[PDB]
Amino acid sequence: MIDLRSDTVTRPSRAMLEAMMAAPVGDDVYGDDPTVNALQDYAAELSGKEAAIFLPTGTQANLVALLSHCERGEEYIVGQAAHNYLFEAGGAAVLGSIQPQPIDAAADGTLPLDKVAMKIKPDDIHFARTKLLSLENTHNGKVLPREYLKEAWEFTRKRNLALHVDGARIFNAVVAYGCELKEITQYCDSFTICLSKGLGTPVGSLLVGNRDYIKRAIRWRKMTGGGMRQSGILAAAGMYALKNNVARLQEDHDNTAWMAEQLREAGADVMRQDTNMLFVRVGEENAAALGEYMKARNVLINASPIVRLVTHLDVSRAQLAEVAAHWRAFLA
Amino acid sequence: MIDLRSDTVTRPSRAMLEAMMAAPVGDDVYGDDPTVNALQDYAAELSGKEAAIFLPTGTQANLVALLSHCERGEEYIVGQAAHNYLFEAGGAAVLGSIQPQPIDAAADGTLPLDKVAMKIKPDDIHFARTKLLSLENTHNGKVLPREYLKEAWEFTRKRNLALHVDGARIFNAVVAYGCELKEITQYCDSFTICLSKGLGTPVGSLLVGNRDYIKRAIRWRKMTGGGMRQSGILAAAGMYALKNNVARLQEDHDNTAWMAEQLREAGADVMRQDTNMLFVRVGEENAAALGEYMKARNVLINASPIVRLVTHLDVSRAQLAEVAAHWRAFLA
Amino acid sequence: MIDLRSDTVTRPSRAMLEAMMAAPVGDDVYGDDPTVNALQDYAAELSGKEAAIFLPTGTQANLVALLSHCERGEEYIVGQAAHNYLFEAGGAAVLGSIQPQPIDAAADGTLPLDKVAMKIKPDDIHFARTKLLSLENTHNGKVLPREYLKEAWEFTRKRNLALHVDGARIFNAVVAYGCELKEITQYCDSFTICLSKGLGTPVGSLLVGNRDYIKRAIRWRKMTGGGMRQSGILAAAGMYALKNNVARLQEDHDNTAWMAEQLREAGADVMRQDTNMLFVRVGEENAAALGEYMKARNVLINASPIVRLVTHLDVSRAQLAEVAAHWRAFLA
Amino acid sequence: MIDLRSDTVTRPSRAMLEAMMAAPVGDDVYGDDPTVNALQDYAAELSGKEAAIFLPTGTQANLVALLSHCERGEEYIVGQAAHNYLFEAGGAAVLGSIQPQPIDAAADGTLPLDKVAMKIKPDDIHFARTKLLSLENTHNGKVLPREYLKEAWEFTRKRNLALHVDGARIFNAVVAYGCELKEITQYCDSFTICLSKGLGTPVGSLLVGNRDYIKRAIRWRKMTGGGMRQSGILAAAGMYALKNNVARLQEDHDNTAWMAEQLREAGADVMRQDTNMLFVRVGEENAAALGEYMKARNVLINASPIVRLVTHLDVSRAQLAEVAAHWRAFLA
Numbered sequence A, B, C, D: 001m002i003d004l005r006s007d008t009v010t011r012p013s014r015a016m017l018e019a020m021m022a023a024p025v026g027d028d029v030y031g032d033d034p035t036v037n038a039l040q041d042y043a044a045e046l047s048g049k050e051a052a053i054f055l056p057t058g059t060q061a062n063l064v065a066l067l068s069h070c071e072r073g074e075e076y077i078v079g080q081a082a083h084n085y086l087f088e089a090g091g092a093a094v095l096g097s098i099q100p101q102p103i104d105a106a107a108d109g110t111l112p113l114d115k116v117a118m119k120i121k122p123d124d125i126h127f128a129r130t131k132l133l134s135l136e137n138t139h140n141g142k143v144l145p146r147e148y149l150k151e152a153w154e155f156t157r158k159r160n161l162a163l164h165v166d167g168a169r170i171f172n173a174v175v176a177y178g179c180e181l182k183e184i185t186q187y188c189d190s191f192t193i194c195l196s197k198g199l200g201t202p203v204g205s206l207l208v209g210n211r212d213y214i215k216r217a218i219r220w221r222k223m224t225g226g227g228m229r230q231s232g233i234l235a236a237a238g239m240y241a242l243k244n245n246v247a248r249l250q251e252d253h254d255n256t257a258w259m260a261e262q263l264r265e266a267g268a269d270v271m272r273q274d275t276n277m278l279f280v281r282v283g284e285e286n287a288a289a290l291g292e293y294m295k296a297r298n299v300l301i302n303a304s305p306i307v308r309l310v311t312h313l314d315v316s317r318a319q320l321a322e323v324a325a326h327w328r329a330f331l332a
Ligand code: NA
Pocket: A007, A008, A009, A010, A011, A196, A197, A200, A201, A202, A203, D229, D230
């Protein structure tokens, strides 16, 4: 099967699986898992932060992050198209009692500080209390301008707002920046990391920040049901991932750059390509048609007027060459 | 002194007070207040709706309407600048567990239906469940196009969405249209009426809609603490207003257009005026000095880079004339 | 028309109505209402507290009280039959995301302190964070022992918990104690006052406490929809009542005492008599019968196996003399 | 290392680790994981229910169960000492806006049905809407009488209440009953199964019920953050444990009874023994000393004046013999 729907579809490697069946464990609720504790310490260490907390999914990572930054009645300025605003069913509001304030992102995927400023609420009882600024790095594959990251940090310190970055794909961003994770993590109060997507873990995400902050996050994770027991067997894949699956995202980047090339030259209307994603304007009259085609041929994609193809460790250039072929076929 | 911060400042007239002191009361929680019952019945019948409920304020009116329409986890599409998203401290989200989907209204005060449609969430566990479309007639003075009021209603029926209209100033819209309330209210499942502003009442709002819908509103009204006792006395002022202070709203609208032309001649930069409101481009430099200047001369106005002047029954043209004079001499 | 259902049915005296009509008013959202300001300033001073806030109802006074005391995730220990746990539809939990921890009260109406200590949750991530102890003075007529009021105050100072008192009928308790209000209010962090019951106003309650605590309350009041405009009309009723209607509460007490004896000798099974209330065991077999019987005689009571009769300024001894006569007849 | 803290400390056996590694997996959010699907189908049929859903923890299992049964403003009657009320930080009230109505459980572990009846709120606006009755079978080791299980079911059928059973240790009960699971789950609308406790799994729980009920459960599971990706690996242990670690549960019961007799002869005051649990009255004086004394001998226990010792598949009788030996010596 050729799965191009998302990078979430990545399956454990032999080496990753061996690391899991071997890793030592304990009861994480009790704080006994050595492997879970080593993954937390590692990550915090790597980003220049005090602590880290392992989570079931990136969704919870974000739900807990927001609950930890904002109190009942506070607000977070976020993207109109951000995951922790749109793709998490409004958990922040529904469950967290936090007021979401969405605004459109600029083309490069950043949230214009000028527009952000206009949304910060006066200290007036008619308004929700603006507390946090939430960014998403590698927003739909888009890499935020490094310098932007620094401005957003300075801007929030001046206005006493917290800055949180949803880094479900922050490593695709580090590889593209060609820098140290620390170099960018230094410009945010807290951030997340998904291990189950490009990094290739079966499950898992991390929440990184200061100790006190992460201390509240533990409570919120417990209430939301994310505190597992012998989770070390899962965190084992997580360390393996961090230590061996990061550089290789460059291969995924190269592959989607290659794919865009094939399709452009194959008639396809390539709208853009960023890191490990590329978009094609398929049209409405073919959205479902192209999906069927590709599916009948063991190629999975999410059919729609604008199709998002995503690369990861479970799809080669050979496999891409085939999708290219079929796509060209379809158009003829 | 001259109050132009808002029409919420209007005070009870002699005749209105007499109606209040003479009103027959009961215990509204038991449902024994005849005058409260009367106000609610009049309003319902007047708009072609089955029921109506009396609330302490317009804010609770909307809070109760949004809770009555949306379940925990449902979402409402609303204006980024609409009172029930922005000016109510995020109550829908915070207190009701409802996900808000704000979008920018068009220049005429309408929420573009093409934009609304794009914000309607697919039936996917990743999204909040879109359930209601909230409108506001007379949005910052702006009277919504009547034809709009019909497409909106049609649009929501075709897409199984409730439609609620925040009518704090719905009568300024009605007086402006030159039609009966029924003609525009026929186009909504539920709407709201504010008695404490233009209509001169000291307190009070009405939430109007279907019988079964208003029945839930009572539970939510009790809970949010708005179920009062011998409130018929307050409801009394509502009857007096609905029957005597609707027509003269026209007096407010004329006093506003005339003031817009006077501030122009005085060199001030009038940005626009709609019904009982106008906004002047003051600037960050004079913003705070101007409110001070006006306050020292007995003119209360909400000082701000852009100044909104609101006219109502406690502010005459003579008084307005003097404000034009002060404004002119302030620019010297 | 003898109304014995509750003291909420009390109606405005002539002296009261006149004051109301005369009260100067303003816009309370702007804080421009002299009467409201005057009301809040008297209640605070009379109790030796810093500030006070006027609310539409007692339910909202307690809901705001609880919001201002407990953050999302915190907890309040309370009585199983207490009004802010059982009788406000659980808004504290439903609206404010507060965990309620009820225990049963002793016969005297107090919450056994050894029982409260047993419910104070350990600082562990499995538990909600106990923060406040809520008492109810004059709990179904019952006057809490004064010593217990001090003991509970010392108990909460010791275990660092906030202490709030629902004082809907706190004046019934004060008049029973025979002391000044400040002598018992000095034993709580915040307390409420209902003006619409024994004190007999049409509307109103007050939440009283430290100025910063009350500042949060103002915010919660706006969000819950209790931010009225020209509410000085209602607040004047409040001042009048605190000036003229406190002392007479002794009259309703003596009337209850009287009535209880009568029903006793008439062969009625009077279960308990406290301040302005008395309960009678009537039975499942007479519940309906009695209510109807009394209704045909213009006597309003809440029928049930156990009838609660409440006395107030609108029930004279002479009328009670009638009721006892009918009840006797009823039992014959 | 002897661990008697809980049965949550069980770790994977070699056979269970092989199952996990060999398990075919897919993406669970898309519904492509064959092992998760099988785990869920299996539990459904074994219990007589239409659907089942795998969650990361027994807590999320109950939060989602609660949210799926009670809408905003509704309420569940539950045990004062129940896990979904006491040990889950109040998530039901905090996140779900659901009002809890706890009550003391009888000595045998059941919630007196007659007690439950007095807590079902009349349909009146002052009260929250009673919707669900929640039980916990094997409540602190206590096996609820089967007659009770049937009675509660009928009672709830008559009163039209949903009945949910928290079954984190439902197999301990099944084995004590000597009946098939189906014979007890036939008496509830929904129930959970914990895999990571006595059953020996690393992580995981199940929530079983109707297909509609579970469909909403999938929505809440996503918002709360339990929608993992390739969780088939985790779920494989689940099938293994359900097919192999159920009957051996009797051994833990026998060991537990046996140990209790050892500790008695050793001079300890054993208060109670049920299924795989037993309690010792150690005393506030020896609690800390005891925990340490054992710790020094590689025996982990949760010290307290009353020590709960839990037996599981990772503690044999030989080890229990060692432990009683240290205890006899401690006492001396
Ligand atoms: Na994966």
